[PDB]
Fold this protein.
Amino acid sequence: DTLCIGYHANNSTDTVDTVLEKNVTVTHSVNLLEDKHNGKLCKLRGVAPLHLGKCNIAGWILGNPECESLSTASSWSYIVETPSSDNGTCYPGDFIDYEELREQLSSVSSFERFEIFPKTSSWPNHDSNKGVTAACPHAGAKSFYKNLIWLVKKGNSYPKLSKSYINDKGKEVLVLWGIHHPSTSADQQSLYQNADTYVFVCSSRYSKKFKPEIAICPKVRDQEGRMNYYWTLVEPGDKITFEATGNLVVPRYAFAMERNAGSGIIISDTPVHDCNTTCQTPKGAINTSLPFQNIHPITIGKCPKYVKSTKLRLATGLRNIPS
Amino acid sequence: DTLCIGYHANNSTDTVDTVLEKNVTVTHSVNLLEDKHNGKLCKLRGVAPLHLGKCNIAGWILGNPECESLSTASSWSYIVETPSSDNGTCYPGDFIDYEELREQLSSVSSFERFEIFPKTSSWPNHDSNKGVTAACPHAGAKSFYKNLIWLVKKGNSYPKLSKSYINDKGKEVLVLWGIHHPSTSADQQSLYQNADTYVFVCSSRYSKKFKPEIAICPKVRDQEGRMNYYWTLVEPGDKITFEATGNLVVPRYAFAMERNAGSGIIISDTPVHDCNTTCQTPKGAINTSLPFQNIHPITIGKCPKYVKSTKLRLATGLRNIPS
Amino acid sequence: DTLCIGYHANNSTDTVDTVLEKNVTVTHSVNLLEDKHNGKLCKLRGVAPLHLGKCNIAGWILGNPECESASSWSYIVETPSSDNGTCYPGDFIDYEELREQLSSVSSFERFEIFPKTSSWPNHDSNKGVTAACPHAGAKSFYKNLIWLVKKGNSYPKLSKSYINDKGKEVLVLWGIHHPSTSADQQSLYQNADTYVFVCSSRYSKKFKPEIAICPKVRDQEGRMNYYWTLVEPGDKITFEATGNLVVPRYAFAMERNAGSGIIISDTPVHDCNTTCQTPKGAINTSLPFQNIHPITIGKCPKYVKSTKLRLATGLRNIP
Amino acid sequence: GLFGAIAGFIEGGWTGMVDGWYGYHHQNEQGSGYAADLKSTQNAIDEITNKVNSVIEKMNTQFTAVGKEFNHLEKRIENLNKKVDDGFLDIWTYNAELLVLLENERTLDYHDSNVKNLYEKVRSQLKNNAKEIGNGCFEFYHKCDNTCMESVKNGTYDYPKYSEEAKLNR
Amino acid sequence: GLFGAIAGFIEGGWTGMVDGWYGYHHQNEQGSGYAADLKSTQNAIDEITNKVNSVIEKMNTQFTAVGKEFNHLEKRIENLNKKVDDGFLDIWTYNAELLVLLENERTLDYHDSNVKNLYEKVRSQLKNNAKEIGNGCFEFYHKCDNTCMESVKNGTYDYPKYSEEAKLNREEID
Amino acid sequence: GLFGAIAGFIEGGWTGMVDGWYGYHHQNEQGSGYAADLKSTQNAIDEITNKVNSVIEKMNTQFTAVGKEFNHLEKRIENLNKKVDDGFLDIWTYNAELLVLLENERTLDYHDSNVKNLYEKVRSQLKNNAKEIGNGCFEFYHKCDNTCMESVKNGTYDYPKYSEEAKLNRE
Ligand SMILES: CC(=O)N[C@@H]1[C@@H](O)[C@H](O[C@@H]2O[C@H](CO[C@]3(C(=O)O)C[C@H](O)[C@@H](NC(C)=O)[C@H]([C@H](O)[C@H](O)CO)O3)[C@H](O)[C@H](O)[C@H]2O)[C@@H](CO)O[C@H]1O
Ligand SMILES: CC(=O)N[C@@H]1[C@@H](O)[C@H](O[C@@H]2O[C@H](CO[C@]3(C(=O)O)C[C@H](O)[C@@H](NC(C)=O)[C@H]([C@H](O)[C@H](O)CO)O3)[C@H](O)[C@H](O)[C@H]2O)[C@@H](CO)O[C@H]1O
Ligand SMILES: CC(=O)N[C@@H]1[C@@H](O)[C@H](O[C@@H]2O[C@H](CO[C@]3(C(=O)O)C[C@H](O)[C@@H](NC(C)=O)[C@H]([C@H](O)[C@H](O)CO)O3)[C@H](O)[C@H](O)[C@H]2O)[C@@H](CO)O[C@H]1O
Ligand SMILES: *[C@@H]1O[C@H](CO)[C@@H](O)[C@H](O)[C@H]1NC(C)=O
Ligand SMILES: *[C@@H]1O[C@H](CO)[C@@H](O)[C@H](O)[C@H]1NC(C)=O
Ligand SMILES: *[C@@H]1O[C@H](CO)[C@@H](O)[C@H](O)[C@H]1NC(C)=O
Ligand SMILES: *[C@@H]1O[C@H](CO)[C@@H](O)[C@H](O)[C@H]1NC(C)=O
Ligand SMILES: *[C@@H]1O[C@H](CO)[C@@H](O)[C@H](O)[C@H]1NC(C)=O
Ligand SMILES: *[C@@H]1O[C@H](CO)[C@@H](O)[C@H](O)[C@H]1NC(C)=O
Ligand SMILES: *[C@@H]1O[C@H](CO)[C@@H](O)[C@H](O)[C@H]1NC(C)=O
């Protein structure tokens, strides 16, 4: 009569590495490395992202005719641009603190577009129609940003304008405006009459004075002139005052918003899908059950640490010796 | 006749975690997680911090009437503000490169307040008394910053101002000044006579030409005008020059200082004491014996690494089995 | 008759430390802490650094007379006493940014963007000199810039453009002079109230003279600000002015290279290859840890303040 | 390897035993076959599952948007940003690799240890009522039927019961 | 137990033995009592204290003011700074916890190894003059008084001096 | 140690065995001498090598410049940069120290284990045919020439062959 003591053995072909020797076949093992995704841009923590499609943040936040602007509604966990989002500033110029605006719009809850300065009743002393250009075409015809209005002289006079807005909303209000720079003195007078002008914008915290800068610059989108875009956040109980004698692209639409901690912007072709994840990647969403991940180094959310490893499987069973 | 081999067991109820089993009662153990502070703001390296009371750095360094400028220590390991310290720039405006200044003052080994441009002898052709305001009220009367002078026209005239200071101090000299911006052209003339004025400040390293920017901005502390604050560190041997035809808020007091590389600014209600520490936290100091702490991630000095652990009990004895 | 089981021992004196005990003498051990360097500044990628000698990047890029200065360099080396930079006092806008982007290039070509011979028919190009920038005792000026000045009491508005026909980025540098007095303003440029305007498809900025008497630096009460920008291939850059403009003469066709750095040191350059460069010397090791210097350029071991990292391979030595 | 049992004095594994990691192979008057030891197998399953869960769960992760956008005049802090991501990458990659290496070795030592202790255990029950024949096998000096094997496995082997019979056949 | 001693073939510990970690419990004609192996217990203390000091003293930290301040237009660098602090947090938190888990396991294995080694040391001396009755106990085949028992504890047991008496008692029970 | 052999019941090392890491020392009426166990020794070297290479090869760092230049008004991001370098410093310093300490213990334990498994392997072959005279030495209760000595080093020792002869040598 015999009684033997032994251990398990199976058809398992799983291999692991130990500090002592490599490629050891064991009975059972588990992968510590998450190396798969869903190739989709999912909703982060329940909240979907804001896909700008063929537009970039600039073109979207401004009224670029090609941009849909959406709008219904309201909040998002992050923003998505496509590698071919070329529709932004249809009129050449500088966009001051642009990266900051994008960063601060990465994740906003409660986002409400409103007509801070109603078009029909705001500017009775200035022309709010001639302010169009071929640089921002819409359906063949000349057009302009939907959120800004390009004021010009009414007839033969540009009266000093002074408009003001008090934040009646219960949140921060993002305000955007532009300063135009004609290419020639001829265009200045033909545009604003005054020749020597100034623009002034200030609140309780913000305060800047703008002077037109006239010169012929290299043609961009067939425009020799330039147009700079500025922006600020007006606190809940604060007042912002605009003042100008010309060269001002007054605001028409502003934005009420409650900015979150701050996420990021993914620039990818990866399609947006109806899925839920706690970790997002430009290539797609991954699970957060494993502590490590080699899908992509640039993630958004509570993600597994990024490593260069190709495999990280932990031996659970014992050395497989079927023999 | 028998001889038995055995191990120790006691009344210990201490439990530790192992990779294999949770909550294993052991006979002896030590804690690696520092989880207690002393609820005190202490001296760091033997040098007390600089507590600005109800004032912030802007209010303290500018000379806000509500702030102590007389008995400030000649050195400090770090600065402490309170969450509600509101007394700063009593006259509304922009304090340029403010955070950088705060940072660069975070630690100092030598600090001497001295009258750079003595009030009695520095401005014979300008009014150095009428420069007061209800925005910065003192003992029941209009007043102004103690470390600056708001020069106004003497009589009906404001001659060209030009004054320089050579740093003969054995160290760097901090120099602040202001540029006042009236809300109207009338106030411009009522203050400085001249309508089209300029200000010029420049050392061997610094240089900037200021120009009054006049407009009616939202009322802050009952002021429609603005006053911008600037500063720079004049190195030993170098000179700084002031030139103006108006709107110049002249320097009266400057600060000789030797900076101590680094340090920070704690903002807490936690009281200060005559205690000595090597690791300070916004809610109390901690002993730097243990390698890990879970009190607060934001610390100053030689501190244990911060962790989200609630317990890091390390077994030293053996498993306890009394039965 | 007997049979004994035992282990090896030798004349080894090497000690290692274990969590349980210190100074444990063992028979065999390997080292993990690299503590040696050749004390030489070598080539990264097989390419020599750009050593600037007594000049800094500002003086080299602007063409300071004391800098007569390859078409490629893995990194840049300045000495702790590289003083010859901007000989005319003033601000160098985005200076640290420029240094960072010149730290390493795969291609670098100086060319006369605005030929001094024909570019300025209505302005003087031979009076723009100063004792602040001496060359062999006599007044001189930056070799890459031209201090344009009025001719015969007249400074007409100038307009000059350059279309980048190089197959890469063009580094254009220019300056804005600021007289100390109105008399010098008129004496130099005549017009008193002047402007300078530069714009491409990206860049755009308007400059104004800030006339004032500032402290003498190198015996100069006036000032001169230095500006630069990268012009994309195919793009045009334009200069407009009525005075105070120190026009570009020599620009740089270049291709920037990833992320290198700058080493300031006296350590001598030497013709040797390395993969990890240190301000004190080079490091060539396969070891994972190093205690030579925290600031290194290349593919280097991680820095620690350990002084001994000895791995025991053999067993406890017991003679 | 570390304990001499697995790939040691027990050279191979049992493809036959398919219900547990460690067990027995009996062969007596009324048949043979394989049968896993439930106590030590379940105990190990609970401890290796705890090990795995520890390396996984202990990984605390803060909500982070790693991405950052810097313009053409912000190269320095862009590279600084690059140094942070790479720094973390090298730290986590090196640590993750050494962890799997190190803990895999222990896991194997842990199984080897369990097989060892199991062998030792049965040896204590049998004393000299059986003979060690190598390869981790016992040969009973008495008639050990099913109910006997069952008592050896569950540690409740009645030594004084078969003690007599065994001492005889020698 | 990796070495199968503690909570292994020695089911429980001794509340009776209060002067050490590892020890003995003798019983003979002169009564019984608990005793602690001072030498092995001392070495254990020294090595464990050196293990605690290593985990603690190897942590040498730079002087650092973690706090940073950024304005409303420096959100990116503020998040960069945040990522750096969060990075160290997740790195240190994870390393701390596992360092505790894994070392705790080794410490328990350590004590276990010590108990096993002590058992084999006694068994090695007794050889045939004693019997292994389990539970980590040895039953002598001869009459082991207090002097004899003490010589086992200090590793000076004279096997030959009891061999003859042991053989007679041995073969009878065998 | 952890396995009782090295610095344990085998109190000292053998300088006479410059042959390898582990081995034997025999003495019969033929002769005597030190002989390292090639099998065990080789495996140790092979595995200890992999260990050393694992600690090293697994580094593989990224190309980094590390040095950064900030001006007099960038003290904040300069101190942020220093915090990064120092953080990495404290991390790699601590983890490097601990690694060497923990693995040095593991390595010594490894060698101890190897010796033990070598000693027990012989102990389990002889059983009664020999006594354990301490210090990891086995005194045969019978004559064991070379053809017998080489047998035990192969684990092919024949117990029964010498069983009866050993029986008598135990008075
Ligand atoms: C004041 C004016 O009309 N200026 C004339 C120049 O526009 C013109 O130069 C040509 O301008 C072309 C574009 O014409 C528009 C446009 O962008 O579509 C026509 C728009 O109606 C006009 N918008 C407004 C609000 O006035 C717009 C505007 O003048 C500029 O954006 C001002 O910067 O220009 C196109 O760019 C051609 O390439 C360019 O030659 C010259 C010569 O025709 O006459 C000017 O009087
Ligand atoms: C000198 C004076 O009284 N000027 C009149 C203005 O004050 C007045 O506008 C009113 O300004 C009010 C604030 O009054 C002070 C102040 O304390 O802030 C009074 C100070 O004496 C004066 N300081 C100096 C050095 O002149 C100061 C100063 O004028 C302003 O700060 C300049 O910006 O103003 C308060 O804000 C009222 O709301 C406002 O109407 C105008 C119009 O009434 O007349 C001025 O003569
Ligand atoms: C326009 C002019 O000639 N201005 C005269 C001042 O230069 C002069 O002040 C003295 O200037 C001295 C330096 O003289 C140079 C120089 O920098 O070397 C001589 C150069 O020829 C001249 N360059 C040009 C293109 O004109 C240069 C230039 O004027 C300044 O750089 C402009 O800022 O000046 C030196 O700095 C002395 O310390 C200083 O007193 C005064 C008095 O002599 O007369 C002005 O007419
Ligand atoms: C939109 O993008 C396309 C492709 O880049 C471009 O050609 C077009 O001009 C843009 N339209 C506007 C008005 O922005
Ligand atoms: C354990 O024994 C000690 C020593 O007398 C005693 O002081 C302590 O109260 C006991 N532990 C507990 C918590 O009961
Ligand atoms: C002990 O184990 C329990 C259950 O596994 C766990 O919830 C607890 O966190 C552990 N230790 C304690 C009391 O924190
Ligand atoms: C306070 O303690 C620290 C070290 O804990 C020491 O550096 C300092 O000297 C102490 N204070 C004084 C003034 O001695
Ligand atoms: C000081 O702070 C209080 C609010 O706490 C404020 O009402 C007062 O105006 C401040 N004084 C000055 C001069 O800033
Ligand atoms: C070159 O540097 C030296 C001092 O290092 C200085 O004396 C000299 O004026 C400099 N030359 C120029 C033109 O910068
Ligand atoms: C450095 O490497 C290059 C090839 O990349 C080679 O041409 C050169 O000889 C090497 N330099 C030295 C001194 O080895």
The CA atoms of residues 5 and 116 of chain E lie 6 Å apart. Residues 1-174 of chain E form a domain with the Hemagglutinin Ectodomain; Chain B fold (CATH 3.90.20.10). The longest strand of chain E covers residues 22-28. Chain E has one domain: 1-174.
